[PDB]
């Protein structure tokens, strides 16, 4: 790997569940997003697939979301495109058959296996993804464009770090840390046992 951009998204208060959306950058030039949740837990889904799943067909717009522009001649803007263009042609080992499928439905189907009956499969997996991807933005599934724009923001920040525009996030700094009391710690084990004690009589 080159670097890893990790973003744990939690909606509402600390007692809601969290989604650890990782954004890696492979040495070969591939950009993969790992949901690292209940579903797609170990699936390194290339970013452009994630963009098309939600309904982003045009590749030019897909690049735009990351770069927020497609005509400015900023050296930062330019270099970003070459990094991103090579990403499209990475030929990933997994998702290769689905790698260049214009049909939105086909892209969704391939994941379902890796996890109008097709509409149900799409209506299932896409809603699942909406619930799993960036919950803090919302889960109505009508804000998908906003989720994609924020994803592009993340790609832009990570790529800027690649180019050395900015330094990597400082771990020790307390600006990005938080101190949780007993309630947060208790709620953790409570979810496991309380559900466990509730599932046991379900059988």
**Which positions from 86 to 115 touch other proteins by CB under 8 A, shown as an x/- string?**
--xx----------x-x-------------
Q: Is 152 in the site for other proteins (CB under 8 A)?
A: yes
The CB-of-198 to other proteins minimum distance in angstroms stands at 26
Q: Pick from 50, 108, 137, 158 the residue near other proteins by CB under 8 A.
A: 137
- In sequence order, the 6+-apart residues with CB closer than 8 A to the CB of 37 are 19, 20, 132
Q: How far apart are CA 181 and CA 201, in angstroms?
A: 32
Choice between 42 and 177, CB closer to other proteins: 177
- The structure tokens listed for 112 are 């379902």
Alpha-carbon distance 80 to 53, whole Å?
23
**Residue closer to other proteins, measured from CB, 3 or 183:** 183
Query: Smaller CB distance to other proteins: residue 104 or 149?
Result: 149
Q: If DSSP codes are grouped into helix, strand and coil, which group holds residue 53? A: helix
Residue among 27 and 196 whose Cβ is closer to other proteins: 27
Among 18, 38, 41, 57, binds other proteins (CB under 8 A): 57
DSSP string covering 100-117, please?
T---HHHHHHHHHHH--H
């Amino acid at each position: 790997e080159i670097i890893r951009g990790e973003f744990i998204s939690q909606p509402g208060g600390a007692f809601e569940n969290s989604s650890q959306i990782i954004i890696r950058y492979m040495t070969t030039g591939a950009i993969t997003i790992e949901i690292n949740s209940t579903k797609f837990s170990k699936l390194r889904i290339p970013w452009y697939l994630i963009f098309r799943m939600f309904g982003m067909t045009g590749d030019d717009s897909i690049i735009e979301q990351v770069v927020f522009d497609l005509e400015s001649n900023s050296p930062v803007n330019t270099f970003m495109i070459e990094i991103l263009e090579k990403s499209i042609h990475v030929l990933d080992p997994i998702f290769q058959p689905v790698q260049h499928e214009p049909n939105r439905e086909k892209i969704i189907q391939f994941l379902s296996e890796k996890v109008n009956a097709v509409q149900y499969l799409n209506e299932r997996q896409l809603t699942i993804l909406d619930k799993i991807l960036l919950p803090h933005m919302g889960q109505t599934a009508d804000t998908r464009v906003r989720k994609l724009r924020f994803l592009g923001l993340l790609i832009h920040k990570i790529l800027l770090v690649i180019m050395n525009v900015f330094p990597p996030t400082d771990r020790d700094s307390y600006r990005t840390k938080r101190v949780h009391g007993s309630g947060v710690s208790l709620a953790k084990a409570f979810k496991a046992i309380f559900n466990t004690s509730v599932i046991a009589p379900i059988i």
